[PDB]
Design a protein around this ligand. Structure first.
Ligand code: HEM
Ligand code: HEM
Ligand code: HEM
Ligand code: HEM
Lengths: 106, 106, 106, 106
């Protein structure tokens, strides 16, 4: 999938999580977010297309995805233990990772 | 100090940073923020007064200040290096941390 | 307490954790480790005594303690939920933070 | 690849890095490590074959490779900047991550 596609995926499932009222539905969305983040990890953003694939910018870019992934994985674990509220709380702070990368490269 | 008092010094100094011209000003502001963040770290917010001090909520609450502190110290480092534009971009970014805890617990 | 004192404290309770067979004893040691790490956070190490309190070295030094603290806090939470095994596993990885700082500044 | 096969490429390339003279060599070694780490990320180790794929153990197991990966990429960045001594100090440091997972799950 393209970056925009993964981003929309991240966005959609994020919304599902905020409303879900059962662990089953949160686990499903998080797994799906993990997949999208894993795929965007290697994408080259428009604003950085003119940079070295090994530039400080791209390294920081990929670093954001490595962070997000860790956070999604951490949240998925909480959901697996059936802690919907905690899982949901984790997703709120996770938004900050989304936002930090956007401020820099969107 | 009061949670309300600590929050006021955090909010006022963030503004000082967003308007700052030099490093002395940003450094002084971040320094006061660090102190307010450190003092707030052990507070119990109104909406969690009936929760166990060891609840996931309270653990997550304390985690938020732990994050904020790390973010202020890093911003402070950027400032100590005369990196104003960078320190300010850092202060702007940590706003999301403020927002995340407010959404869940304010 | 002096740095050496906190270090010995960190060391001792670390050993208690590895052997404890009940959550009560792990919670007690972790709380105590948290206290010692919090205190060493501000200490100036022998090898860095000739550096600027705001030098890259000291910033990285303090950063290690901020990491450790977060990890201890995370482990204490697991112990509070009564997950001795998980708590104990957390402490093993935590050792790496101890070791990373020592390699650099001990 | 096999967990044993991936572990052999991780161990052999670490040695190559410890003996390296230039960046080309370290970079090539770290690159192969990243690939082996990425492939191992989803393995189930012998001592956890009877555990649920969602157990805290397995979640912690996957977390270890998540850490390792972040450490190899950072080391790789140091290498891509011709920072050999630094890339090597980084490779030496991540050994503890290897050690931590072995202690718990090998
Ligand atoms: C879970 C967190 C995230 C959410 C909810 C999210 C959501 C979005 C959305 C809705 C868009 C709008 C454009 C579209 O998809 O049509 C977008 C764009 C973008 N995001 Fe994210 N995003 C997240 C995390 C990240 C991270 C961590 C990075 C960087 C490491 C990143 C980099 C970008 C970039 C570069 C764009 C612009 C893509 C383009 O040129 O069309 N995003 N994101
Ligand atoms: C740099 C970030 C922060 C800023 C600028 C900020 C700002 C504020 C402001 C303006 C208020 C309302 C007025 C006041 O109470 O003085 C407030 C309230 C509050 N903040 Fe923050 N805040 C920050 C971070 C945080 C963090 C990270 C947490 C939790 C971990 C938090 C928890 C709260 C709570 C619970 C209240 C309600 C307090 C009450 O009802 O008495 N804040 N904050
Ligand atoms: C929980 C993890 C840790 C444990 C178990 C631990 C244990 C120890 C021990 C046993 C010593 C031997 C000297 C003595 O205390 O008599 C020591 C020394 C030292 N550690 Fe740690 N330590 C830990 C974390 C850290 C961290 C994260 C840093 C840096 C951020 C650090 C910095 C130092 C330094 C500078 C010394 C030398 C102190 C001196 O000059 O005597 N330690 N540590
Ligand atoms: C850079 C770090 C690493 C190095 C150099 C390393 C090296 C090795 C070596 C030499 C072996 C024994 C020989 C072999 O199986 O080929 C091994 C086995 C093993 N390693 Fe690692 N390893 C690393 C990281 C990790 C990590 C982080 C984990 C877990 C998250 C892990 C889990 C295991 C397991 C379970 C075995 C036993 C496999 C079996 O019984 O088939 N290793 N490793």
């Amino acid at each position: 999938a393209d970056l925009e596609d993964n981003m929309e995926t991240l966005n959609d499932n994020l919304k599902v999580i905020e409303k879900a009222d059962n662990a089953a539905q949160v686990k499903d969305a998080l797994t799906k977010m993990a997949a999208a983040a894993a795929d965007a990890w290697s994408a080259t953003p428009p604003k950085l297309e003119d940079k070295s694939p090994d530039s400080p910018e791209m390294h920081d870019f990929r670093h954001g995805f490595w962070i997000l992934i860790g956070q999604i994985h951490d949240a998925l674990h909480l959901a697996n233990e059936g802690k919907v509220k905690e899982a949901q709380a984790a997703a709120e702070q996770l938004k900050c990772t989304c936002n930090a990368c956007h401020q820099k490269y969107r």
